[PDB]
Design a protein around this ligand. Structure first.
Ligand SMILES: C=CC1=C(C)C(Cc2[nH]c(Cc3[nH]c(CC4=NC(=O)C(C)=C4CC)c(C)c3CCC(=O)O)c(CCC(=O)O)c2C)=NC1=O
Length: 184
């Protein structure tokens, strides 16, 4: 692991995310993410919003801490996820939970630096549909992003949390509609 307070750190975090998730999000989404990365660098040439980059870095350096804290909260509130017959019982499946947890955070950070829910509309909404095609309707999943939200916002002040909270709310609402309107 490695943390940094530079713009190159956030760029590298997005690059590694594009590489790791390319096969999962599909080709239309990696094109969106590649264009996003090119545009953020172009506008960085004209000066970046320091408050947004500060919140973005703070969540990025503590990504694994947030992932571990949220996953621990989720297993406690819903032990059926890791129990036999659960979706995260298998060590590979549980590792995939933590992977998507860190991926969900990257999407949150992509919205922070841009101040727009665009990356969650394009990449997030499509991946939630594909994630439910492979998993199915598991009611404990609704508490997933809540644990991620509570674990991320606990590292921010009230002003920074108010800036980040809408993107978590947007994902939870989207998961809610995908959850209860999937087989319809
Ligand atoms: C851009 C960020 C991106 C995001 C957030 C995603 C979600 C996503 N997960 C999965 C698969 C996926 N997820 C999980 C677990 C999980 N995810 C959670 O958020 C929580 C919580 C849990 C644990 C309870 C498992 C076990 C599997 C494999 C299931 C199977 O193959 O049969 C797919 C289908 C394609 C694939 O296999 O990768 C997609 C689209 N894909 C991106 O690229």
């Amino acid at each position: 692991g490695r943390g940094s307070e530079d713009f190159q750190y956030a760029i590298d975090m997005f690059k590694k995310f594009i590489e790791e998730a390319a096969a999962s999000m599909g080709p239309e989404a990696v094109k969106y993410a590649k264009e996003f990365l090119k545009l953020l660098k172009e506008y960085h040439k004209n000066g970046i919003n320091n408050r947004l980059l500060k919140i973005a870095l703070l969540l990025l350096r503590n990504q694994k801490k947030i992932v571990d804290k949220a996953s621990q909260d989720l297993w406690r509130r819903h032990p059926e996820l890791i129990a036999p017959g659960g979706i995260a019982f298998s060590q590979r499946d549980r590792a995939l939970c933590l992977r998507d947890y860190g991926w969900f955070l990257i999407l949150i950070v992509m919205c922070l630096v841009s101040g727009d829910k665009g990356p969650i509309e394009k990449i997030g909404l499509k991946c939630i549909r594909e994630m439910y095609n492979s998993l199915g309707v598991v009611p404990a999943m609704m508490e997933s992003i809540r644990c991620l939200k509570e674990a991320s916002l606990s590292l921010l002040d009230e002003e920074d949390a108010n800036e980040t909270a809408p993107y978590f709310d947007y994902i939870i609402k989207a998961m809610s509609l995908e959850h209860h309107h999937h087989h319809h």
